[PDB]
Design a protein around this ligand. Structure first.
Ligand SMILES: O=c1ccn([C@@H]2O[C@H](COP(=O)(O)OP(=O)(O)O)[C@@H](O)[C@H]2O)c(=O)[nH]1
Ligand SMILES: O=c1ccn([C@@H]2O[C@H](COP(=O)(O)OP(=O)(O)O)[C@@H](O)[C@H]2O)c(=O)[nH]1
Lengths: 403, 354
């Protein structure tokens, strides 16, 4: 009846550029808040939070300052104290050999440790283990009982077990311990074959009243902090996770793009078809694509992402014309290079509802951000109001009139 | 005769991020510097520098703060003084309230207009004096240009007109005036303009290709040339302490078969040199990088040594970002060197702070 939440790395507040806002505490806060919202009596599931100790006092303050009971534990703390089966030291061998310094080690080496430490943890202390991405189900009842075998949850994307939820009934059960050794023989990124060293039973995550969300935070790059939630556009979701970030955080938002002159999409050298823009990339009779600019004469020759082929030809236009796959001559587009904000991104995307949502929740409205004109080289420092005048977006009536 | 220099756009000093440092003034200054070099006497070819009138006071100060005599003239002043040059100002207003290519187009147009109004020579600010030779720019009798770098025909970078409103120069203008395009070299085919041997004048042209949308800004274009002479030569035309988001300043962190140090990934699983743009982690300057910072990143001890002597500040902060994992690190040049583990330059910057 124990719940092990685990976060490896710096707190999402202090790592606002490489972490998702509330990626370590939203679930545990929502869980503990929900765990003491069903059991009218005394029956409450102990919640443990394992982190590096440099953030024990910080994480411990977060959970009581949110009004929830979560005893924060340390990674090293339960290793200083060993355990008679003490020989677990393999964990620190991997721990020291990759990430003992300050700079955030490469993410994959942390997800590796999450795997290893999660398997290790249930060997020493029985109960459940959840990723912090495991919140409580909506309008359902949370039920985390205590069974008799080591069981995990269904590998949601495959047909096997998965780390996102596990359970062990006794300290060093001859089934949890054997799974650990298979990880130590070939430790690697998400090795799902340690469970294949036996026949691990399955737990239906839905039957517990909880649910898993996949943030996929290693597959390449992503949006940082609160930007990850602003893109989901559920104002409920943003308001929920806003406590775990800063509405005023400034970040280099390489995603914040916008084209200056709109160009078109079409259809073999004249190619001066009647598009209404000053330029377009058009698909030819066959072969591939071109780049045409009516103002000069260029007709550079540059299967996916842009395909106008039947009925309407020189008629379609903008969308995600980021065709900057042809890194040849192209139209001019604007990019945030430094100190952009949520409000800045909202102003660029011409999302008046988002500009209004942020301005109400307390966002400062005239902070400066650094923008560049890519190919050109023009670097401009803009307030959200100044960006809005430049981009010609009818949202200044909101920014340039107080209220 | 007369030498017509032309610059369309903002002064490279005030545009250190979209222009090359000394792309507008290095060539013309060295020209005047070379014309006065000998005991020639008093006769010296008059040099004109054509720019937008807003930067007349800036340029007039720049050439005077140097030891050169260059009469700066305004593009808009001569077009208002004119006779049917409304096409020039019509092109001026409908293009240049911008895009560099739109600019180079106006350079081509205004240069042809210039030789129609005022006879003499025209050179790009890229046209320097030749090395160890003597500059000899006489006054001939026909409209003649230099030879294009590629192929075998005429070119815009060096031209000549002998008389005001020559019946051949004016005609070349008209071929451009109603088929305007980027580098329309077919206006010269409307006759056979004689050819000028660039070596016989004592001047030489360099090509920066400033409109390839991928160049280096300000002094970074010269720091990459690795010629300590070339940077020190052009360093007056920039700022050794300028801060820029230098996205080109990138670095690596690394380098069933055997693949040694990856580049497949041994430490992890993996089921699937600079050219690395692929769907491997690296660091990139995202804000306020400097020449010294780039030198520190590139592990160019000579550049770190050359810059530190020429007066570069060594304790400015720059913003760097690990690519895959959003990580922002604020670094002094020394701190970048310790982080990147650069043996000699780290000790060199630590000892220059005390
Ligand atoms: O920097 C990180 C990233 C992930 N995790 C752990 O992994 C979970 C996040 O998993 P993610 O969504 O990134 O991957 P997926 O769940 O889609 O496999 C968190 O709740 C933590 O338990 C962590 O501790 N630190
Ligand atoms: O913004 C600009 C860029 C260029 N130029 C003029 O065009 C020349 C650029 O020549 P470049 O070497 O870049 O072109 P290339 O000759 O290599 O094609 C400069 O010297 C200037 O005379 C200009 O007036 N404004």
């Amino acid at each position: 009846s124990v719940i092990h939440y685990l976060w490896v790395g710096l707190p999402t507040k202090m790592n606002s550029s490489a972490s998702i806002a509330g990626h370590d505490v939203a679930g545990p806060i929502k869980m503990a808040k929900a765990l003491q919202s069903q059991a009218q009596g005394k029956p409450i599931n102990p919640i443990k939070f394992w982190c590096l100790e440099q953030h024990q006092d910080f994480y411990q303050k977060l959970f009581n300052d949110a009004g929830v009971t979560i005893e924060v534990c340390g990674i090293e703390e339960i290793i200083r104290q060993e355990s008679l089966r003490d020989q677990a030291l393999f964990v620190q061998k991997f721990l020291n050999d990759n990430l003992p310094s300050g700079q955030n080690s490469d993410i994959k080496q942390r997800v590796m440790f999450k795997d290893l430490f999660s398997l290790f943890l249930l060997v020493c202390q029985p109960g459940y283990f959840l990723d912090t991405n495991v919140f409580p189900a909506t309008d359902r009842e949370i039920n985390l009982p205590g069974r008799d075998t080591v069981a995990t949850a269904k590998s949601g994307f495959q047909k096997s077990n998965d780390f996102y939820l596990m359970y062990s009934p006794q300290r060093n059960d001859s089934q949890m311990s054997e799974i650990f050794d298979i990880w130590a023989r070939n430790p690697s990124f998400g090795n799902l074959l340690c469970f294949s060293g036996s026949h691990v039973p399955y737990i239906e995550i839905e039957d517990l009243g909880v649910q898993k969300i996949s943030y996929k935070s290693y597959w390449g790059a992503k949006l940082p902090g609160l930007f990850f939630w602003l893109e989901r556009n559920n104002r409920q979701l943003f308001e929920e996770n806003l406590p775990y970030g800063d509405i005023n955080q400034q970040l280099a938002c390489s995603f914040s793009r916008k084209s200056l002159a709109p160009c078109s999409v079409c259809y073999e050298k004249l190619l001066a078809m009647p598009f209404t823009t000053n330029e377009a990339y058009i698909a030819t009779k066959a072969n591939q694509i071109f780049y045409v600019n009516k103002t000069t004469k260029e007709c550079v020759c540059v299967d996916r992402f842009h395909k106008e082929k039947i009925r309407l030809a020189s008629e379609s236009e903008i969308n995600q014309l980021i065709r900057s796959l042809d890194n040849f001559s192209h139209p001019s587009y604007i990019v945030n290079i430094a100190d952009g904000t949520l409000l800045h991104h909202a102003v660029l995307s011409n999302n008046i509802k988002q500009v209004i949502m942020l301005l109400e929740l307390g966002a400062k409205f005239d902070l400066k951000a650094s923008y560049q004109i890519k190919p050109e080289g023009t670097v401009l420092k803009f307030t959200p109001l100044e960006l809005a005048n430049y981009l010609k977006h009818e949202a200044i009536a909101t920014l340039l009139q107080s209220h």
